[PDB]
Subunit: 69 residues, 13 copies
């Protein structure tokens, strides 16, 4: 029940983080394609957005470990 739990926490975190990052990176690539002169600003939004999106998934990863250990 600890294994099963740790899996669910980690698995959902993976899905959460990957997809969120993908959405953000994709938006960045599309934006940069549309407006190459906005390279920097768009790259900044990506660099701010990604960690924000990963925050809660990262915490869920820690919780997965706490369950396992």
């Amino acid at each position: 029940m600890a294994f099963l739990g740790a899996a669910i926490a980690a698995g959902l975190a993976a899905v959460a983080g990957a997809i969120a990052v993908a959405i953000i990176v994709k938006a960045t690539i599309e934006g940069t394609t549309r407006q190459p002169e906005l390279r920097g600003t768009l790259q900044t939004l990506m660099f701010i957005g990604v960690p924000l999106a990963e925050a809660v998934p990262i915490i869920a990863i820690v919780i997965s470990l706490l369950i396992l250990f």
Copy 2:
């Protein structure tokens, strides 16, 4: 049961927070790409929106920990 419970809360909190942030950040990137002069304006809305969206997932994270410990 506490392991499984803690995993469900944290896992759904991860999905919730990550995706919500991605939607907000993507909207900010797209708006910025369309009207670069609004970059500060949209950034401000992102900075307000993200914590608002992360609030409940964060509380579910705390509940996840209360279930575990």
Copy 3:
């Protein structure tokens, strides 16, 4: 059974509230992008909409805690 319930109430509340906020913020960002002179109007709509959207998820959080304590 209590751990499982608390998690389900909290996890669904997280998904509900985060995504609802994201939808509202996204709309505010898109509206402001189209009509920047209306940002104050749109912000007021966002600041009314968000708590209204968070209302039931918050009660579900409370219900989650009542299950645990």
Copy 4:
């Protein structure tokens, strides 16, 4: 089972209400952006629509409480 029941009721009510409100609020923001002169009319519709949308989720929340207590 009272715990699981209370959770399911509260969790679904939360998804139900939050998303319903968000959809209505989004429409209002989109409409107001598109026709700023209609801002009062659309705000009235939002103020009528939100309670209507929340009516059944609220009743579900009460039922959630009746099951828990």
Copy 5:
């Protein structure tokens, strides 16, 4: 089992009713935006449409109570 039942009926009725109303309300907001002259006409369709969509969810709420009592 009665608790679980009452929760499912109430939770689904909530989702059913909330989303149906939001769909209807969103439509009259968009229509009113496109044709402000049809404000009263569209609003009437909203006031006819909502009870109809809420009819079965309400009956499910009653059924939810008959299971609890």
Copy 6:
């Protein structure tokens, strides 16, 4: 199991009926917005379409009651 059954039948019926009505009413609202002179014509189709869509849901409600009683 009768409680579960009555809940599933009533719950699904609610989702079925509410959404179906919403789809029909939205189409009526959208049609009326495009063709204000066809208001009566479209309202008639709505008044014909709603009971047909509700027919099986209300039958599932009866069955929900039969299971409960």
Copy 7:
């Protein structure tokens, strides 16, 4: 397990029938809006399409009762 059976069959039939009719009616309404002259012609297609769509859901209801009785 017969209560569960009668419920699953009735609930699905409800979703099946209600949604199918909604799709057909909405199509009739949209078509009439697009080519009003064809109102009667489309209504006949609606009156033919619905019973055909409701046929198997109706059989499923009969089966639901055969299980319950």
Copy 8:
């Protein structure tokens, strides 16, 4: 397990058959609206497509009864 089985096969047959027919009828309605002179040709395609779509669902309905009886 026969009640449950019969219900699964019948419920899934209902959804399969109803939605398939609705899709074909919607297409016929949409096409008639665009090419009124093709009315008969399109109506014929509907009268061929429906039984073919309904073929397996009907068989599944039979199989449902073989389980129930």
Copy 9:
């Protein structure tokens, strides 16, 4: 378990076949509407695609009976 199994195979085969036929038929209708001159060509493609699409669902039906008997 033979009842459940047979139900799952038959039920999924019904969804598979019915929906696939609906998709193919819809496409034949839309094409015919688009180019009435190709009415027989598209009709041939429909008469070829449907049996191919129904192939595995039919086999699944046979397997369903082999489980039942």
Copy 10:
């Protein structure tokens, strides 16, 4: 469990093959409608794709039989 396994394998293969074929045939119908001159080359593409798409589902059907027998 052999009945459950054979069902799941056959049912899923049914969905897999029927839908894949439908998607390929639909595309063939739309291409032909759009460019009737390419009818031959598109029909060839359909005759290559369909067996390729049905391959693994057919293998899964064999496995379904092995499980049964």
Copy 11:
């Protein structure tokens, strides 16, 4: 449990392979329709893509057999 396992692996591999192939082939058909000069180039990409997409599903089929034997 070996039967159930083999079914899951083979069933999901079927869905994976069929749908992936359908996606790739559909793209090939659409591009060839728009630019018939490239039918050779496009068919080559289709013939490189399909085995790649089928690789892991094929492995899952092998694993399905190892479970069975």
Copy 12:
């Protein structure tokens, strides 16, 4: 449970890798269709992307085998 596990890991890996490749391949086909001059530039992106997308699915295949052995 080792049969179950190995199947889940292989099945999900199959869906992951196949769909991922299909998406990437489709993108390559669409780009090549629009800008044939970029045929080899796009093909390189496909050859970088595919193994990157297959990475984690490959590891999940190994894990599937380790579970069985």
Copy 13:
């Protein structure tokens, strides 16, 4: 349950990682197709975005292995 756990974490991480990469790679291909002169800038974004998206899935695989061992 360790087999179940290790499977769930690996399978979900597979879906997470594969889909995310495919989304980023696709966006890179589309962008490059539209602005070939930005191929280097877009490729860089792909090489930054991919490991960011794979980060949590990779961790979830490590957790998968920690469950197996």
